[model samples]
Target chain A: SGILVFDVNETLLDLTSLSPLFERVFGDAKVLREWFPELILYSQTLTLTGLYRPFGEIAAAVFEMVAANHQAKVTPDDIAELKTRLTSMPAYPDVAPALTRLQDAGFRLVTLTNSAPSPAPSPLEKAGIASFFEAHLTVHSSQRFKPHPSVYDSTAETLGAKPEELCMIACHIWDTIGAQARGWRGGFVARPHNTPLTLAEVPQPDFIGRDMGELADQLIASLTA
Target chain B: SGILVFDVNETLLDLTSLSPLFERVFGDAKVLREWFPELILYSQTLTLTGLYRPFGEIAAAVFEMVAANHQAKVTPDDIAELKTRLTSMPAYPDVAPALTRLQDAGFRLVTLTNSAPSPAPSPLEKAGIASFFEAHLTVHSSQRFKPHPSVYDSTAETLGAKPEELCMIACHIWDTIGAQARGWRGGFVARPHNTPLTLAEVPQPDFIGRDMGELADQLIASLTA
Candidate 1:
């Protein structure tokens, strides 16, 4: 019925695949969780301050910072493996099927990620779900990360949809707040590492689900009515 | 000489004082490091998305989320202790002397933090550094956190100074980037937990030192000369 914009990386693709590398390097797989949020913090900081750096570069810089904090050394091969694994993560088990269901229900599917445009097969393509999307949007053109109003506004404009006609789907509460603040409906997939932010001052998501399949069920039932 | 605007939390006050509570609650003092950055991440996210929440509320919520992730149970007393310790940490060993040196060098001193204005004896007051600053600024007025341009702009306007007339000193790189991006000079205090962001696209700090004392040495030698 309307455009459903998915967030790449942790929302659609699995990030736990990189946990093994963190365990090998930092002696704890949990360092992956620490590294990821710090990456998001800097990306948004860059955008808020009118600075720009590709997501991959920020990811590398954050990784190095985390290593430094732990007094660990990151080899060149470790960096290379990070780039490879980050871009080639498999889609979550329920992502492809939910995307298919939404597409079949007459919803326009697309992706908006902070990641830069890559060569031939993008991360989504590598994840085997590129065909489910109508178009892939990124912070490249806008040069701002998500949760900034401009990123969502430019996204809606690029897709030829109004803000009200789009629904943002993400595992992160910040992403949900960003889209909902800009008049878009929000769908939150409460992944194990994420929880909905409950605050009176913040915008809450319209749909909350345990996974992509549950989210898709809610979306189909509500939006198609 | 330019006005020196300090960031009060980690820049002046020692955050490690709160590590005991985190250790008792989460079984690791290092969880304090993880919790702090996530708090910054959410505060900036709220600002970037045009939302407003008091820093204390956000801090409490972030603590709850961290506890949930660790499957740890935080007691009511733990939350109360967190508030007490957070606002009453002693000044870093090098901070008060540095502030005195900078002020005696004919520079106006001020502070801008994301924290809300408390009753009497604010965090800076509790830390015994309140007399060093002529005015205390908080995001309470601007309703945005550090690393957002608006927060810097508003602070400059409020202080009746041009952006170039202010130098922001902080232990965090993101705060450095925010002030520098808004045309204020940046002084980076390389705390153990913070490192300068080494990227070509980002704004570089004007002064980087081991601590506030070293940073004051550079500032007095360079700016006062």
Candidate 2:
């Protein structure tokens, strides 16, 4: 009965790989700091409006806006290339081992994200944690984006994991806030992760911690022996 | 005070005017559909998120996305042309006299919209009702979108009208609901206007009628006859 769900992109993945890439391209990691916020904003906006766009497309579009607003010379193709880099990021140090520990402990494991579906396995494979996850869940597959209840529900629904039985582990405060808001059990992982708080007017995270390992014992205990 | 607060866009001017331009440049009116909904979604999300970006940039981004999603070859200049046309749409058939009657009744007049702001004279100016309204109010300026109590309260704050004295006369049930939510009087303008019942969420207004003319009677009865 043990189901341990994971959220990728800075949860398991070491997003610092993109830090240097963003620095080289945008002249500061803060360029993405500006753009990623708007990208997530547009991503959720699309979902609320009943429109669908790949997260990669949203990333490119808002990046183009950020570059324009910042007076950067980045072209549309440049913006596209930045998103292409998302497909090649590596996992954080503890992800694979923690995933292995959970799987070996007889827990069903999965990864969920709002990224595009065509390149579903690419990021997981690139992170080298592909074999550890039973499913790579993209909310885009449900045509929903994150922080939207449907996105959270679809992730839990896909695994047949009830809100109480499964602890959704993430490196994002917003992800945890959104998960717990929808009644999902939650665990926050601080993997040098930078995804900000979800809608602040919404509720907050249930369990907060530093890494998957920090959460490993408690989750195992909560779900199993 | 017989303040004739007319709803702009579809209630007065034909918003569909810009559609042809977008379709000519983007090959579909669907772009306008996509843009408008997100325009509303972000208008609220920004207010909810405690941040702000101007309405036009948001509109432009939506236009860019609609074009990108449809694979249309629209340039920034093409988007500018679509925006320029928004300033040229005219008022609907009954607006002039309807506004005139309220003015004759010594009502302080205004125009209310869920649309964003512009630097120029209001959409009322473009719609040819510039002379009729004493002011133009957009939910953007209010920083709260429809269905939130703040939208109507902010409108009264702008007009310096008391919630009890100023009745929000609109066709949309949600707009009236928002007014009701704010403890403002709301009257439903039922002709060519309707929405899901939102009265449960707000204080039901005293004067609901089949048309603005019917509302005029309700207004007259409330005042010294």
Best by DockQ: 1
lDDT of 1 by residue, A1-225 (tens): 889998898899999999989999999988887898899999988988888889999999899988987889899899998999999989988987888889889999999999999897988888888999889989899888988889999998898889889999999988988999899999999777788766667878899899999999999999645
Docking verdict class for candidate 2: incorrect
Task: State the interface C-alpha RMSD of candidate 2.
Answer: 13.9
Q: Over the stretch B1-225, how does candidate 2's per-residue lDDT look in tens digits?
A: 644455665556766677787678766554454455445554545543344455565566556644554567877678678668765677655667666767777788777876677666666676667887778788776565554556666778888777666767775544555565566666765543132232112244567766566666667667775
The lowest-lDDT stretch of 10 consecutive residues in candidate 2 chain A is A193-202
Candidate 1 lDDT (Cα, 0 to 1)? 0.88
TM-scores, chain B, all models: 0.97, 0.76
Query: What TM-score does each prediction get for chain A alone?
Result: 0.97, 0.87
Instruction: Report the Cα RMSD per candidate.
Output: 1.6, 15.1
Q: Comparing only chain A of model 1 with the true chain A, what is the TM-score?
A: 0.97
User: What is the TM-score (0 to 1) of candidate 1?
Assistant: 0.96
- Give TM-scores for every candidate, taking all chains together and pairing residue i with residue i: 0.96, 0.52
